[PDB]
Amino acid sequence: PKIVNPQLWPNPNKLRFADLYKYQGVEMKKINDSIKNYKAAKFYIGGILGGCLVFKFFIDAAVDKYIFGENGNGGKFLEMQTINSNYDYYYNRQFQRMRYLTEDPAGDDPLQKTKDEHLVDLGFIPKVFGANVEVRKRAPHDKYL
């Protein structure tokens, strides 16, 4: 396309100064060489995309085989394996029971709880209980850990 020239200065003569006009051409020449590679690669890229289209139908049947199995009850998707020995497994279960029985000291802030002085003035005189010194904390079944 034509480029509008403000004509603020005269351009150098092309015959006297030829090097000043060459860069634009060699730049588009590089792109033309790249397009020759893009066009020549149509069958190679298309053959791969065609293979993916055929591979798509085998992957569909393999996923349903992987998930549903032979008789629709579940395939290898339901399988899970491990490298833990029998001791490693029962160590982890006891580690779960230990963390269940791992508490922090002091509990919560008592000042954020209902005061006994407030209950008296509200009409309910609270009864003082003793500490339950006979109960032993234990871990629940493994299904709850």
Binding site: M80, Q81, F95, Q96, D104, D109, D142, K143
Partner: protein
């Protein structure tokens, strides 16, 4: 106008309203985030076109790119990398966080701003739930003993015993005998 907001409801019965607007059949296959990918991704596509402006003066295009960067920084915020996050205000719908509604700690982190008390501590219930160890994969190539030893380990089928907490891997705890080399900081 308050009666105009209820126009699509006056022609329907209650059963039709519930089936129309409440009991939308579940379909979690849509790419809902394509709206954001198209919008924010347009900045990159616009740059591909804008980087070819025939403005002869280099410093003229410096002004154009600066103006275009001003449009992006209204969302991105911090121009430096690894510094912050962009800010986009999105619409509130029933499908916000739809795939993480199961997790409780995600809800507490998003919704609740707890008030610290005089006894300045995390609530004891929260600390107790946090000590129940998470599951950490046994596969590890970062420790050179496991990188060698696990090449001779035999993966045995872990038969399901009816629970959801089978510790078939190691536990994400600094005191676990298989995780002590991991730095929990």
């Amino acid at each position: 106008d308050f009666a105009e907001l209820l126009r699509p409801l006056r022609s329907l019965s209650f059963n039709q309203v519930v089936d129309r607007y409440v009991l939308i059949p579940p379909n979690h296959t849509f790419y809902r985030n394509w709206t954001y990918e198209k919008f924010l991704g347009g900045f990159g596509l616009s740059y591909l076109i804008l980087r070819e402006l025939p403005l002869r003066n280099f410093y003229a295009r410096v002004f154009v790119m600066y103006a275009f960067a001003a449009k992006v920084l209204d969302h991105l915020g911090n121009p430096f990398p690894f510094s912050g996050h962009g800010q986009i205000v999105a619409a509130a719908d029933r499908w916000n966080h739809w795939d993480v509604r199961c997790y409780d700690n995600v809800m507490k982190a998003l919704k609740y701003i707890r008030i610290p008390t005089v006894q300045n501590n995390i609530p004891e219930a929260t600390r107790w739930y946090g000590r129940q160890p998470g599951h950490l994969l046994r596969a590890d190539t970062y420790w050179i003993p496991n990188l060698v030893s696990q090449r001779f380990a035999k993966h045995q089928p872990a038969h399901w015993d009816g629970t959801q907490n089978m510790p078939i891997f190691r536990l994400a705890d600094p005191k676990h005998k298989d995780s002590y080399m991991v730095q929990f900081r």
